Amino acid sequence: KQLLALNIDGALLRSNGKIHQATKDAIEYVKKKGIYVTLVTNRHFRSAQKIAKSLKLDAKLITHSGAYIAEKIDAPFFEKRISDDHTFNIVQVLESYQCNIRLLHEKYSIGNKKKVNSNLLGKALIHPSDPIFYPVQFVESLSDLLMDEPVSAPVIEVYTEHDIQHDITETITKAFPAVDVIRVNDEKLNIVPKGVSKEAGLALVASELGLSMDDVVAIGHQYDDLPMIELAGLGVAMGNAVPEIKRKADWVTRSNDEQGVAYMMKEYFRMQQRK
Amino acid sequence: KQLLALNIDGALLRSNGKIHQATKDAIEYVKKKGIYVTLVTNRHFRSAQKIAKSLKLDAKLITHSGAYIAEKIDAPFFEKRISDDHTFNIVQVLESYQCNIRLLHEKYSIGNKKKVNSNLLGKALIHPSDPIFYPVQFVESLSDLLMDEPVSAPVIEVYTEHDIQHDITETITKAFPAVDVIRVNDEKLNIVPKGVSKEAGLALVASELGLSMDDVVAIGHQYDDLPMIELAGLGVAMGNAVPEIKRKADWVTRSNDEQGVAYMMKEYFRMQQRK
Ligand SMILES: [Mg+2]
């Protein structure tokens, strides 16, 4: 294998947001062996890049659910975003539902203030804004703000109770042919430009490197990771993934709180040594 | 003539920052006659675009001294910026001089806190930051900040007393072949990527429209406007420009506090009617 692609949340990071020393040591070793290491994430580019900096990756990172692929923010390798007018229209529709909305731009994030009965929203790791490089604000009315401040969003994140996800998904897919809806988990959807995804972004990076998906190890933990797990040469589910995802993977490793990334890569190399 | 290009500061705007009703009326008339109206400015893109919105321009605007040409911020027609490493190195050199430095990014601006004996700095119109869309911050040490927060700047603005401009200009030009130094006035320099300028940006826009510089009316007021004044089919100096600029123009109009833009365009049309 020639390319290792890792989720950040639920894989690289422990549930307290720390990167374990064993994980750092495993990634350093992987790189020393000539394997290209990148991140494949729903996180905004800036958060992903600071993590990459900690791991000394110097790689094209696949961020904003595949909509933004870059090594340095001002000069992306691949970018796609929802038009400002479509973003406004989508926000108006979502405002009629009980859902928390976040426009996840690479330069800032803006969300509404609607409270939802969602525990995964409560569990999700919060990471810093920066008042210059990444302001994060909430407003009571997103669509009112967008009237005078249009936003062209690479990703719109939608948190809800599970009961209405199918309806929101149907309503958006039908009304907006320019976007796709990606189910992340029971309480979170990403709305992205049509054709954008983690697996599509990963394919673009592998192709750029002269590799195929056959040459890729992909490590994921949620529903939106399933396609890259199925399509990669070796698709790995973290121990903290739900049972369905674990059944669908080629390989199940330990959890993100038990250094499952390091554990899996140690075995990958033992396998190499045996062969 | 087919294309009207206007400065914002010192031309479109009165010295109190207001756009006079006569100016609005003149621009509406120009557009109704089929003439393409755009802005050519040292201002950051966002400030230029809000002004364009007020004038209902819907045009490609030439901003950041020609480094950023766009109708909508996320999707530029033309962009060039100084690399992050060159930006850092340039800032380090400038820090050894008595000068106020501002990194004029399209998403934010960051400057140092050095005080200079400069009245044109005192006179220059301040326009709003926005905590989401355009944060503006000052730090004691720009180069220290850039160590952990690299910036790839379309323009670096440098304010000084007049006595050291030549030395700074020489030092930068010699040390950084990837950039050009543009003298704006006796107390302000812009450092831009090589080949970037107001006149170059204007040429790119005219070419995109199937026009030549011959078809352009350009209205400017400072040293950095001289090339487009000389190169445009009709180059106009505002009344508030210094005498040298007024001598070099084809036509001198009234000042920005006496509606010189409106006054000049009224004559342009009287000329048309006579012909
Ligand atoms: Mg861009």
Side-chain angles (χ1 to χ4, degrees), chain A residues 68 73-76 79 81 106, chain B residues 68 73-76 79 81 106:
Chain A
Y68 203 83
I73 200 163
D74 302 297
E79 61 174 345
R81 62 189 73 239
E106 74 278 16
Chain B
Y68 203 83
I73 200 163
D74 302 297
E79 61 174 345
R81 62 189 73 239
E106 74 278 16

Side-chain angles (χ1 to χ4, degrees), chain A residues 9-122 124-250:
Chain A
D9 298 275
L12 182 72
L13 298 191
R14 291 179 58 83
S15 60
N16 64 7
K18 295 200 174 270
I19 306 169
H20 197 272
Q21 186 64 51
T23 306
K24 292 186 176 177
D25 296 345
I27 290 165
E28 177 174 30
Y29 187 85
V30 169
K31 284 180 74 58
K32 192 186 172 217
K33 295 296 290 190
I35 295 156
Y36 189 98
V37 177
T38 190
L39 305 177
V40 47
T41 189
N42 293 333
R43 283 199 177 205
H44 63 79
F45 181 74
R46 175 178 166 83
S47 177
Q49 198 279 330
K50 296 295 194 184
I51 290 157
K53 192 179 173 187
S54 285
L55 298 171
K56 305 168 262 188
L57 296 190
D58 299 310
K60 285 168 186 51
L61 309 172
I62 299 145
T63 72
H64 296 257
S65 201
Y68 203 83
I69 304 169
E71 193 177 355
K72 292 183 186 187
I73 200 163
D74 302 297
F77 169 65
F78 173 83
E79 61 174 345
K80 261 203 99 170
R81 62 189 73 239
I82 303 168
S83 70
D84 45 22
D85 301 315
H86 285 164
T87 295
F88 174 85
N89 289 338
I90 291 164
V91 166
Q92 284 199 311
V93 175
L94 294 174
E95 283 176 344
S96 72
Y97 291 88
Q98 191 60 43
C99 71
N100 184 276
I101 306 161
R102 189 171 208 156
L103 309 177
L104 193 77
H105 190 276
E106 74 278 16
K107 179 60 200 56
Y108 51 81
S109 168
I110 317 174
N112 67 350
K113 289 182 179 190
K114 278 205 189 162
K115 291 155 206 305
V116 292
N117 307 343
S118 161
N119 282 333
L120 289 161
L121 182 54
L125 288 159
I126 300 195
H127 30 103
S129 78
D130 180 90
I132 298 176
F133 294 100
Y134 205 80
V136 176
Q137 166 157 17
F138 304 98
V139 291
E140 185 183 9
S141 177
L142 269 181
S143 71
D144 283 353
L145 181 81
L146 298 181
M147 312 244 62
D148 291 298
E149 293 295 350
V151 170
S152 187
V155 174
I156 297 169
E157 300 180 317
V158 184
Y159 269 97
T160 70
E161 300 184 50
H162 184 245
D163 65 343
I164 67 170
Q165 273 197 330
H166 175 73
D167 185 7
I168 292 181
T169 300
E170 180 160 64
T171 301
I172 297 301
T173 303
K174 192 166 175 284
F176 305 98
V179 304
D180 283 336
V181 176
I182 297 172
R183 185 190 187 233
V184 178
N185 59 47
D186 286 354
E187 292 161 16
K188 190 184 184 177
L189 304 166
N190 288 341
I191 300 163
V192 294
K194 189 158 186 67
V196 165
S197 69
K198 289 172 157 168
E199 64 271 21
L202 190 48
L204 291 187
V205 170
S207 292
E208 176 69 9
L209 296 172
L211 308 168
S212 65
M213 290 303 283
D214 298 338
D215 300 310
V216 179
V217 180
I219 306 185
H221 79 294
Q222 304 191 285
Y223 295 115
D224 62 324
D225 302 310
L226 277 171
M228 75 176 191
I229 287 164
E230 266 103 281
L231 293 160
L234 183 50
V236 176
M238 298 290 308
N240 43 289
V242 299
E244 177 187 324
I245 297 172
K246 293 196 284 198
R247 286 194 296 273
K248 288 182 158 181
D250 306 327

